[PDB]
Design a protein around this nucleic acid. Structure first.
Ligand SMILES: [Mg+2]
Ligand SMILES: [Mg+2]
Ligand SMILES: [Mg+2]
Ligand SMILES: [Mg+2]
Ligand SMILES: [Mg+2]
Ligand SMILES: [Mg+2]
Ligand SMILES: [Mg+2]
Ligand SMILES: [Mg+2]
Ligand SMILES: [Mg+2]
Ligand SMILES: [Mg+2]
Ligand SMILES: [Mg+2]
Ligand SMILES: [Mg+2]
Ligand SMILES: [Mg+2]
Ligand SMILES: [Mg+2]
Ligand SMILES: [Mg+2]
Ligand SMILES: [Mg+2]
Ligand SMILES: [Mg+2]
Lengths: 150, 80, 129, 205, 82, 123
RNA sequence: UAGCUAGUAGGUGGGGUAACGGCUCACCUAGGCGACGAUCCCUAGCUGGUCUGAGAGGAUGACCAGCCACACUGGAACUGA
RNA sequence: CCCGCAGAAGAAGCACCGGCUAACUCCGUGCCAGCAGCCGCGGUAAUACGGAGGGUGCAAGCGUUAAUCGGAAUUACUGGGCGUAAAGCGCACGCAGGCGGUUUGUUAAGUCAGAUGUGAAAUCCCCGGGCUCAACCUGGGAACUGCAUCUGAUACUGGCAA
């Protein structure tokens, strides 16, 4: 349950006097498979260094998320930059269907029966995140009584 | 009765050639909003009796003219 | 304008709440109250009050639980432009079950839970959670 | 409609044994297995979630000897059926007669078990069934036809069948060469190295 | 007039008739007034193969209705009471 | 925006112009070869591409591509044309079914003979 | 395409049809329809359903069944339930 | 449908392998010949042209074309936008229309409720049954989200009154 996996790696150029100087960007996601998910970014001239430096950032920066069994309690909508995502509990038939790149954060996060889809731009760096928050903002299926009661 | 219609007049200036409005209300079948939708009806009113702006009760009968298949039963109010 | 006052209520909550504001007041109406009622009975507002007579003055006490406010979201649904009327089998349940839906019926402003039991339906004023 | 091609070449690409030469020896070698399905066999298949998603359902196919069209319906049926799509696919695939013929020993390899079926040397509850696809249900009673019995093949077939993990959901003879499919196999029997939700995923998008 | 007939809803070589009450002038497999049984001539000697709401049939015949020749049989063949 | 607004003038769907007046959506169409040119392509590329201008069974006069390495096709040749533009050759929006009517299969092709219309060479 | 309408809209009476009826006629009234889109123009048989879509929708109306219309084109009637 | 007879005997092709995309090398060619769904390949080491060996995918089919919907939240009712990306009429008044503060009464059209009728059969779906399996055939439910009539409910909307 270490369980990590990268979503996307990408070249990017910097351009100076002597020429273009390229780099790489890794975008990873780690989770315990039981709550607690996090993503990190981190970039570096070589690829290994990049994916590497990324897991590390995803070690920290790892929030956790009030599941409700293998699934979500209620349906939720997340939205960062131009990414706008939606996912549903979906009383598992089998489920876990969703655009790879949030399959990733859903998978390692423990949910086992989501159906989701991403609207807006499908820029990973922003849907992962749009969903992390999406799961984050999602509130306690019991400790909403907590909220109310009094 | 078998059903009744309501509706205001709109035209009485014609020899029992009275025409009656029938304002219903209805959910737009695509955009949800409710809209006004009128139904003018050429109705028979023997001895021309109601006037424009009289609310009235109406009932479906057999044909009396290419255009008339209804006749009045009651009036309800006047001067608008 | 003042044309929809219920959205104005919904929003005075919504706003003051995000302003961490203790109370909040507004011109009252029969309607307004019957709702605040439900808000209270279901524990979203702290307690209301109508300090008026000729120029009535509905006044509400907002609650804050942890650090948050108790009202994570308050939207209008029906509105004078476009009125919504769901039957009963069609009554909408918010946040799965958590949170509520304020609905007016042939017998008073209730909650979707309540209305569902009542066995009836009506104009679904707004959603709260 | 039957693959027909160098059976072993498949297992080497899919990276495991799919018991297609099944026959005698085991844990291949005396074959070549692994590091050259082709000519650039050495090369490391670093591959898309698509690649691995594909190759898995491919692997399962190269086993039961099914072609895309049927397999596609098998999946389409699974889904229709209540209860886990990915498991259900595995149910259907097992209930296959050809399968419940090698899974009873009567045949060396599923490929051969099938050859029997097509040659009407098998019967269900009495009656000669000669189509591989024949779904077998619980309580059924598949048995070699008296005509052509304890014939060459079916001997060693019944034989090294015992050298197999040997099932549970079905009760075989060896004298009668009859055998009772007792229950629809559970997820837990069979499997281990086969990944449904992948191939379910393949047919999901 | 109104007849009760077979209406071969079957399948090439493996027939299967909807017995129906209809307007005798319409197509055999067309417009009818109501269904009132069926008759599977390949039934096989297992269980079923000639259900036949006798109470309706008798109703229409009291209304005037006439009856086929192969329906005729089926009736005096479902014996009638047992 | 407004519901009111949408109500008066509802939303409408942009209609799609086909890119291939193979008139009434036809898998292909017949034609007689008006003239059998060859021109050269657009900015990046550089070549002598073989084409022909065809008068169609339905009277559209349209230019089409003659795929392959070499082709015995001339004026008055009766050919068959299919959807298939050639981006390189602006305004060339159809291809010519090698091996149909008067058109020939490509000589000596071994690969992808179904395309380019060649018979299974007597093995 | 912004106006359209003289049997036009209604009344009375005769005639008429298996029947109600401007169906028709004579006379009287001056009506009737129309931006909730008439008139004009373009296109088209309608349905059950069919394909697709998570749905909402979109697209569609072979094969089956229902209704309608047509029978070389235009027009007419006779017979007959 | 059953029984015998002979001999593996009469029975495998099509597209693809630069990326998207499952599958890589050699030879030829040299901005030519040519490819191409989109990006783009070809000017001497071309995994993109053409042939060859190998491989991947389908299989009595395989490819290409044409065609609807899908992915397209890209006409956004569900479900979008207009400062600088497409988009606020140069500004104002104002008919129709849309929307309208607050109390009470009344009305009961909208809205809501139950009852009843109707919503053909086939189809679709659910559980079975019959053809060696299946396609196919078939029993029975379910569904037809609709319409209409009656009776009720009065909070909201509309009508009336003050
Ligand atoms: Mg086949
Ligand atoms: Mg018989
Ligand atoms: Mg008269
Ligand atoms: Mg969609
Ligand atoms: Mg026909
Ligand atoms: Mg004629
Ligand atoms: Mg006559
Ligand atoms: Mg690859
Ligand atoms: Mg090619
Ligand atoms: Mg070279
Ligand atoms: Mg769309
Ligand atoms: Mg936009
Ligand atoms: Mg601009
Ligand atoms: Mg009010
Ligand atoms: Mg039906
Ligand atoms: Mg069966
Ligand atoms: Mg009121």
């Amino acid at each position: 349950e270490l369980q990590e996996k990268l979503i996307a790696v990408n070249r990017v150029s910097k351009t100076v006097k002597g020429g273009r100087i390229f780099s790489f960007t890794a975008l990873t996601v780690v989770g315990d498979g039981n709550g607690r998910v996090g993503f990190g970014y981190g970039k570096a001239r070589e690829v290994p260094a990049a994916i590497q430096k990324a897991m590390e950032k995803a070690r920290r920066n790892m929030i956790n998320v009030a599941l409700n069994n293998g699934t979500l309690q209620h349906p939720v909508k997340g939205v960062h930059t131009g990414s706008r995502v939606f996912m549903q509990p979906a009383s598992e038939g089998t489920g876990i269907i969703a655009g790879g790149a949030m399959r990733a954060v859903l998978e390692v996060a423990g949910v086992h029966n989501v159906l989701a889809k991403a609207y807006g731009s499908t820029n990973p760096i922003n849907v992962v995140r749009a969903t992390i928050d999406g799961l984050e903002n999602m509130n306690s299926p019991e400790m909403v009584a907590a909220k109310r009661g009094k | 009765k078998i059903r009744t219609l309501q509706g205001r007049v709109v035209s009485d200036k014609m020899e029992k050639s009275i025409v009656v409005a029938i304002e219903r209300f209805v959910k737009h079948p695509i955009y949800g909003k409710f809209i006004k939708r009128t139904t003018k009806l050429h109705v028979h009113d023997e001895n021309n009796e109601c006037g424009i702006g009289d609310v009235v009760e109406i009932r479906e009968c057999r044909p009396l003219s290419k255009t008339k298949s209804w006749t009045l039963v009651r009036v309800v109010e006047k001067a608008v | 304008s003042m044309q929809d006052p219920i959205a104005d209520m919904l929003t005075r909550i919504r706003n003051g709440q995000a302003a961490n504001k203790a109370a909040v007041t507004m011109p009252s109406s029969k309607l307004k109250v019957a709702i605040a009622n439900v808000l209270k009975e279901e524990g979203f507002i702290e307690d209301f009050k109508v300090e008026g007579d000729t120029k009535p003055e509905l006044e509400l006490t907002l609650k804050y639980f942890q650090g948050k406010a108790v009202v994570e979201s308050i939207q209008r649904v029906s509105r004078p432009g476009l009125r919504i009327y769901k039957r009963k089998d069609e009554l909408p349940k918010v946040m799965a079950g958590l949170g509520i839906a304020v609905v007016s019926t042939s017998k008073g402003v209730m909650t979707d839970r309540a209305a569902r039991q009542a066995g009836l339906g009506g104009e679904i004023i707004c959603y709260v959670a | 409609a039957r693959y027909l091609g160098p059976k072993l070449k498949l297992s080497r690409r899919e990276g495991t044994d799919l018991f297609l030469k099944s026959g005698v020896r085991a844990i291949d070698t005396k074959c070549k297995i692994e590091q050259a399905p082709g000519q650039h066999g050495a090369r490391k298949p670093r591959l898309s979630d698509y690649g691995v998603q594909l190759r898995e359902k491919q692997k399962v196919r190269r086993i039961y000897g099914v072609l895309e069209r049927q397999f596609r319906n098998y999946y389409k049926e699974a889904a229709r059926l209540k209860g886990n799509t990915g498991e259900n696919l595995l149910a259907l695939l097992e209930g296959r007669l050809d399968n419940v013929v090698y899974r009873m020993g009567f045949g060396a390899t599923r490929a051969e078990a099938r050859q029997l079926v097509s040659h009407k040397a098998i019967m269900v509850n009495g009656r000669v069934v000669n189509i591989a696809s024949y779904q077998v249900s619980p309580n059924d009673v598949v048995s070699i036809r008296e005509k052509a019995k304890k014939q060459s093949r079916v001997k060693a077939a019944l034989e090294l069948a015992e050298q197999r993990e040997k099932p549970t959901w079905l009760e075989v003879d060896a004298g009668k060469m009859e055998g009772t499919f007792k229950r629809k196999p559970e997820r837990s029997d069979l499997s281990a190295d086969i990944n449904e939700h992948l191939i379910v995923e393949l047919y999901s998008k | 007039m109104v007849t009760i007939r077979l209406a071969r809803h079957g399948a090439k070589k493996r027939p299967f008739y909807q017995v129906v009450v209809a307007d005798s002038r319409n197509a055999r497999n067309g417009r009818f007034i109501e269904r009132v049984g069926f008759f599977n001539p390949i039934a096989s000697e297992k269980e079923e193969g000639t259900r036949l709401d006798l109470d309706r049939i008798a109703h229409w015949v009291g209304q005037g209705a006439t009856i086929s020749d192969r329906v005729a049989a089926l009736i005096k063949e479902v014996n009638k009471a047992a | 925006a407004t519901v009111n607004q949408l109500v008066r003038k509802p939303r409408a769907r942009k209609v799609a112009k086909s890119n291939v007046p193979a008139l009434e959506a036809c898998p292909q169409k017949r034609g007689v070869c008006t003239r059998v040119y060859t021109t050269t392509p657009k900015k990046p590329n550089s070549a002598l591409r073989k084409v022909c201008r065809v008068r169609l069974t339905n009277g559209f006069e349209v230019t089409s591509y003659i795929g392959g390495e070499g082709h015995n096709l001339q004026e008055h040749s009766v050919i068959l044309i299919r959807g298939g533009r050639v981006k390189d050759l602006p305004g060339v929006r159809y291809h010519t079914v090698r091996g149909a009517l008067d058109c020939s299969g490509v000589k000596d092709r071994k690969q992808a003979r179904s395309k380019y219309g060649v018979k299974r060479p007597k093995a």
